[PDB]
Symmetry: C3
């Protein structure tokens, strides 16, 4: 078959990044709107003193950093250039494992490069790369230099931002990871608006429901989550939260799973008052907390 | 195009294996029947003291070892679990080089992972990995952790058990090897029945027909095989067989090729009397032997 | 889908190469005509004392070296054998990035091997591998042992000669390079005719038009090329050419780009008189030169 039409569609909207820092390094980025906004990875541009964007048509320009988001490994850039080709968006929840995809980037600085593979899996958290993980996995060859570039579906629509690989060799072994478009678009929109992403911030821990601690517990291996360990000087601290008490309920929503609950708390607004309930065998043990702002906190695992 | 339907079909019947031994290691396995029998590689489970099977639906269970077959690198496991999804079988002789295939496994423990490539070649013996080799070769990315998992055709039917790779880097370089379904089903059936595979056993050697030894020989570079070297205390020993005499005929079938003849002898039954003929320029030199049982004897070449 | 028909078409015309030198090494080659001419890489056969060709059908024969071309990394071999299968030719300019292709070779000596990927990019010069570069890039897995073998389109027609890879691991990371058929056929035809390729030869340098040297220059960042540095005892030497003067015109054609101009000079005939113009702010500064012959001057970058 051929993916030429998909490449023709998407490749004009993928650029090369050349960054100098204290010294030179390489990457990719995706043009998201004709106004000149670009998505790339945080680790590509972090601390850079100059960022050059090189387009497929040959034009080069210096970019400005709009803002960056280390906890998803994303960053937004802005350029001032006319008649820019923008990427079409795919549906990252609309993808299935086994669908064909294309990676577009600048591996090893050889030039813009298209590789092909399939969606190997979706929803990869537990990789231990970023705080907020939801990776698409792909076997399209992805190498140092691909970071910040496009993962595209078989029609050329954007489904992710290529980010990381797992390798024992320094280069592709067919296990690569892209940030899904749905996550990346959120981050991008908020950075454009507020210079960063405003998360609901707690300063608290939580880990899995081990079986024997909840064995004695009346419920049976589901529908709850075990808590421990607490950060200090912040609102859970001031709200009476503390290592060892277990969390039934935060903002009235049961925090049954750790990753779910990170997200919910993340999608809250700082300064707001919300109630929190620590463990007792009954319904509640009632605390309150003022939602704070969370401070500030091609890769290979 | 998309392979999503093929993945939907086959992925439920591929499990993760977690084994502890004297210490923890990882692998994959394929559910072959709703009764709970699973195929995997011998090297994954060999000497394990505990074997956990983790299904795509989230269920986990301990497995029992039915039996194992080091000389093909296969092993059979059994689990006790209801409403199990079983793999459909493909036709491993029905495949052609250039057909698309999918590998399903747990590379590096990242999670169940689907990779895509083509049949690169079939019939790979001479790899020097197992005594009985007939590998399918594939460029679908295959890594440590894939061993024991499924190679599937473009419709999701099982064509092989992923086993080994050739790499200079510790991970996929696009040269991987799967045990064909036709071989694996034989092994599986006999292990389920007899706890191992019963081979016809000789205790004898044989190597290629070098050209100048058979130059003088009247026949012309075909249709025969040169012999040498003999194991002892066993039936060829007791049958009057010995290093240096060349084999015309075993069980009346001319042993013209070494790998062919291994197989024939393998598919004989121990305790049976069969006749053997050593080299002389005429028709025969007649010995007899009682067929013995052959004793006990993700990988990277 | 399946590429079996494409493999059936092309694989008979791809051979294994086994070369002994002062000691044994491996490679591939492509049968280009039924007369027994074969293309492979220069680095595979360079300095070999014996070259064996092994065909897919099992026939083996010794090959003769027709001639070789180090500056494109190509070499031509000849064998004497009947009923030979010849490769069909594709159109290497007719390919688009994103088209599917197949690599056919003998990676690591495992046997003839087919791998699949896409055209990742075309026109790769600046790799620094050969003097005359125009590589097709592909993510079809290509390993040591693939050099001299076929890159084929989805219908099995020849589009290139697999040559090199970029890797940090000694094997495929999905960045491989093939010499396009259009270049390779030229080289092959001239070697068959004249034992080598006759290039137009100058003995002179040239590098890019830096911006500030041509800033002051009236023209604006296009349509010219800056010169420097000169080889000696040869015709530019005898023609009055020299480091520092900048070249407007060679054989009346403006030498605006370095790689273009190499080619033009290459496609000229030795012994011919052609005029050359060095830099002055006006039209010309007029020299003459007698075109000389250029003397004599799976890889991993």
């Amino acid at each position: 078959v051929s993916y030429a039409n998909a490449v023709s569609r998407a490749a004009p909207a993928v650029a090369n990044l050349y960054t100098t820092k204290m010294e030179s390094s390489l990457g990719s980025a995706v043009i998201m709107s004709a106004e000149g906004y670009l998505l790339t990875n945080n680790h590509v541009t972090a601390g850079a003193d100059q960022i050059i964007v090189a387009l497929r048509d040959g034009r080069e320009t210096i970019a400005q950093l709009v803002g960056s988001d280390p906890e998803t490994d994303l960053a937004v850039l802005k350029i001032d250039l006319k008649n820019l080709p923008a990427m079409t968006l795919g549906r990252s929840d609309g993808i299935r494992t086994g669908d064909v995809c294309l990676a577009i980037g600048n591996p090893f600085g050889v030039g813009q490069t298209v590789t092909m593979g399939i969606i190997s899996a979706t929803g990869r958290n537990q990789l231990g790369l970023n705080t907020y993980e939801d990776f698409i996995q792909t076997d399209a060859a992805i190498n140092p230099g691909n970071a910040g570039g496009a993962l595209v579906d078989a029609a050329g629509n954007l489904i992710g931002i290529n980010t990381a690989i797992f390798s024992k060799s320094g280069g592709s072994q067919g296990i690569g990871f892209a940030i899904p478009t749905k996550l990346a678009l959120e981050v991008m929109q908020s950075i454009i608006e507020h210079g960063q992403v405003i998360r609901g911030w707690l300063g608290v821990e939580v880990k899995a429901l081990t079986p024997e601690l909840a064995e004695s517990l009346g419920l049976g291996e589901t529908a709850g989550i075990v808590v421990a360990g607490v950060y200090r000087d912040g609102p859970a601290a001031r709200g009476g939260l503390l290592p060892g008490d277990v969390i039934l309920t935060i903002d009235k929503q049961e925090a049954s799973d750790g990753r779910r609950s990170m997200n919910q708390v993340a999608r809250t607004r700082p300064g707001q008052k919300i109630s929190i309930v620590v463990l007792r065998n009954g319904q509640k043990v009632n605390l309150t907390a003022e939602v704070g702002l969370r401070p500030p906190p091609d890769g290979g695992e």
